[PDB]
Amino acid sequence: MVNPTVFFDIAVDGEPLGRVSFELFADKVPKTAENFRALSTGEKGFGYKGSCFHRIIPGFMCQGGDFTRHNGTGGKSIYGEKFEDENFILKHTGPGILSMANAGPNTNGSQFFICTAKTEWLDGKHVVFGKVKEGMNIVEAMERFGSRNGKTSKKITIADCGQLE
Numbered sequence: 001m002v003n004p005t006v007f008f009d010i011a012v013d014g015e016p017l018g019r020v021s022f023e024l025f026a027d028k029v030p031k032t033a034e035n036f037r038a039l040s041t042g043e044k045g046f047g048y049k050g051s052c053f054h055r056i057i058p059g060f061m062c063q064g065g066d067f068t069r070h071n072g073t074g075g076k077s078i079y080g081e082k083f084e085d086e087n088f089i090l091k092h093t094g095p096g097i098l099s100m101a102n103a104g105p106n107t108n109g110s111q112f113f114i115c116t117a118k119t120e121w122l123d124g125k126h127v128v129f130g131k132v133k134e135g136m137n138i139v140e141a142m143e144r145f146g147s148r149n150g151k152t153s154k155k156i157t158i159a160d161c162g163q164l165e
């Protein structure tokens, strides 16, 4: 009946920065939304708490969710190491969009990105499953620690995360 909301509390070299919350589009991409919800709560015994944003390209996006290898080579879903592209209904319409990173068709795990620009070239090959609800300003503050090749100048972490309400 109503889409779930999750939060990240972000820190920069261990110092609190602020809270980002996300609406998850369970009404359109239930399986993909549920994966991200569950990794956010930690209810399977693993998830996003303590993981880093390993690649931030200002004017493009912030990428994270690699809680196994910390560098963009890892992660897993709650269904198995990988799961399918659920659908490509939703498009990358502008800043704030939450979408799955991948390495080929039907290779989703835990890695995700938050768009800081419209990224229409990703439509139809990356599954869009949510958007930033509050704290887009905190995403903009994070983005400033990225660089052209994505390497971050300070360590950007999910200090805490879970489900709101």
Ligand SMILES: Cn1nnc(CN(Cc2ccc(N)cc2)C(=O)NCC(=O)N2CCC[C@@H]2c2ccccc2Br)n1
Binding pocket: 054, 055, 061, 063, 071, 072, 073, 074, 075, 100, 101, 102, 103, 107, 108, 109, 110, 111, 113
């Ligand atoms: C060097 N490196 N840093 N991170 C990665 C991770 N990665 C591959 C990958 C994704 C998900 C799983 N489960 C396993 C692997 C990746 O960034 N794939 C591309 C991708 O998903 N995206 C989404 C937005 C940014 C990035 C991208 C997509 C398309 C063009 C450029 C770029 Br950069 N690899």
